[PDB]
Amino acid sequence: MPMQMFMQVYDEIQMFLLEELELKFDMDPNRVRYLRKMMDTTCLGGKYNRGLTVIDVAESLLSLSGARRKRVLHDACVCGWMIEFLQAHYLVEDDIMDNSHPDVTVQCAINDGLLLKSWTHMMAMHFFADRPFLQDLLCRFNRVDYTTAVGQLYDVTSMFDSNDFAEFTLSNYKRIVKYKTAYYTYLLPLVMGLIVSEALPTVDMGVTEELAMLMGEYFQVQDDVMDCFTPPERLGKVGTDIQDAKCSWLAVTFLAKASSAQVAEFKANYGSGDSEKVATVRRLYEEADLQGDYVAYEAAVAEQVKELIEKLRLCSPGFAASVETLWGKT
């Protein structure tokens, strides 16, 4: 039911946006079908983890606060697609970076990124036009989007001096995860479910924020280990953190427990595209027993998560019963 309903609302949102362009923006059919194909290509196909969470939060809050049910669930579906379109916008922005007379493909990619972001506003301004939360929804959405761009700056420049391994620390790694990922992937869907369920001021936002940051940290650490050790045909992509000199959990944990000569061997091999230098880094990770530390670190984070949900149910029992699927889905 949630996935089926989420996909029906997608057709409703797409048709509004495309008809709006045809009827109010003077768009010709060729470009309308061009934009329908682009929207499907960039927004569909993922797992919809962020979008379906808005639904799951909304349905749990109308079970413990007729027509109010139908409207809230539909509102949650629009909010879910706002985040999905936002995610598609971020992915298109990423494709422009690694992809490299007017090159019309780079022009259209930049145009795609601007349209996907604007569509989050257009669908909000339309389907929520008569909602009292429309102004608060836009402000929280815009602020979280700003947060993500700030975290991208922290990530992209973690190895330099914005006009290097000093910023390879656990607290900075958490700062990167916090802003680059956790706020829009974990905090934003939860907040949006609360907004459409009219239960925003009824929850402890501090414990909510703290949970979202902890869950983003847990899933980024797992992502970092898989990026390095999971082979490409099983990970789904090519792990490139070592070559890209990312401030990953493996790097900052290694630098703390490595010897001075191992740090020199790591610093001399990190951030290179050569096959043997990357393998030299993986060898250092293995010999430092990092995957042994990975299990303990995740377990400790899991314990902080498995216990912070309890502080939240004492004032919001249904809300905490929506984050129940944080471990019904890893």
Ligand X SMILES: Cc1nccc(C(=O)N(C)Cc2c(F)cccc2Cl)n1
Query: What is the binding site for Na ion (CB under 5 A)?
Result: 49-50
Which residues, at least 6 apart from 329, have a Cβ–Cβ distance to it below 8 Å? 49
Give min distance, CB of 91 to its own copies, in A: 13
Show the tokens assigned to 202.
């009824």
Q: Is 185 in the site for ligand X (CB under 6 A)?
A: yes
By CB under 8 A, which span of 49-57, 158-166, 223-231, 249-257 interacts with its own copies? Answer: 158-166
In angstroms, the CA 100 to CA 95 distance is 9
From residue 41 to residue 70, what is the string marking binding to ligand X with x (rule CB under 6 A)? --------xx--x-----------------
Pairs from 141-148 (Cβ < 8 Å, separation ≥ 24): 141/82, 141/86, 141/188, 141/192, 144/183, 144/184, 144/187, 144/188, 145/86, 145/117, 145/184, 147/179, 147/183, 147/184, 148/90, 148/179, 148/180, 148/181, 148/183, 148/184
Tell whether residue 95 is among the known ligand binding residues. yes
Give min distance, CB of 157 to its own copies, in A: 7
Residues 159-178 that bind its own copies (CB under 8 A): 160-163, 175, 178
Q: Is 178 in the site for ligand X (CB under 6 A)?
A: no
Q: Is 142 in the site for its own copies (CB under 8 A)?
A: yes
Quick count: other Cβ atoms within 10 Å of Cβ 147? 18
Q: 165, 255 in Cβ contact below 8 A?
A: yes
From residue 257 to residue 296, what is the string marking binding to its own copies with x (rule CB under 8 A)? ----------------x-----------------------
Q: Tell me which residue of 181, 83, 67, 182 sits closest to 124, measured CA to CA.
A: 83
By CB under 8 A, which span of 58-66, 97-105, 257-265, 311-319 interacts with its own copies? Answer: 97-105
Give min distance, CB of 19 to its own copies, in A: 14
By CB under 8 A, which span of 101-109, 215-223, 224-232, 286-294 interacts with its own copies? Answer: 101-109
